Write a protein that binds this DNA or RNA. Structure first.
Ligand SMILES: [Zn+2]
Length: 178
DNA sequence: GAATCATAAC
């Protein structure tokens, strides 16, 4: 350990970082949030990747989903913000993590095309879809072509308009806040 | 000049 890819693991242990906790999972704030509200849900049981998912994890997934929603209500109930819950198709960090993220995407840590695409393309597998996928197939189906999705031209998730750069995309999103 | 991209990080 000490390796950056182990980061999350260390952070889940730290009580200070623990936003929520129960016998199955733990919820922490994303250290480099891509929105005003960005949490990660992590299971205590070590699971490497989604490629290692079978029906025995089904309930756990559902739990993770549930907890996610609860976090919203508990820490963003006063918020009018839309939320999405899902996983990245190809994760960089070890240990599976559910993204719970507000759809404002108002954050200085959202810096490049890869970030934006990671949250606003098929690369972002919604939790619900994943859950049904396991229920129906007992396995997670990942369509090929994921890395390329990260290179697609910037497009607003709100008005579906094309944008030429991150600064411009941000300036554009600013006005959707109202 | 500004933003993006490519690559290393000892
Ligand atoms: Zn828009």
């Amino acid at each position: 350990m000490g390796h950056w890819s182990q980061g999350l693991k260390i952070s889940m242990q730290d009580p200070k970082m623990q936003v929520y906790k129960d016998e199955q999972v733990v919820v922490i704030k994303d250290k480099y949030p891509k929105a005003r509200y960005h949490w990660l849900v992590l299971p205590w049981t070590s699971i490497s990747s989604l490629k290692a998912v079978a029906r025995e994890h089904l309930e756990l997934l559902k739990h993770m989903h549930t907890v996610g929603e609860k976090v919203i209500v508990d820490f963003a109930g006063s918020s009018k913000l839309r939320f999405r819950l899902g996983y990245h198709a190809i994760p960089s960090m070890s240990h599976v993590h559910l993204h719970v993220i507000s759809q404002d995407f108002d954050s200085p840590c959202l810096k490049n095309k890869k970030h934006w695409n990671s949250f606003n393309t098929e690369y972002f597998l919604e939790s619900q879809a994943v859950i049904e996928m396991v229920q129906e197939a007992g396995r997670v189906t990942v369509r090929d072509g994921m890395p390329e999705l990260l290179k697609l031209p910037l497009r607003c998730h709100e008005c579906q308009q094309l944008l030429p750069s991150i600064p411009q995309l941000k300036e554009h999103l600013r006005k959707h806040w109202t």
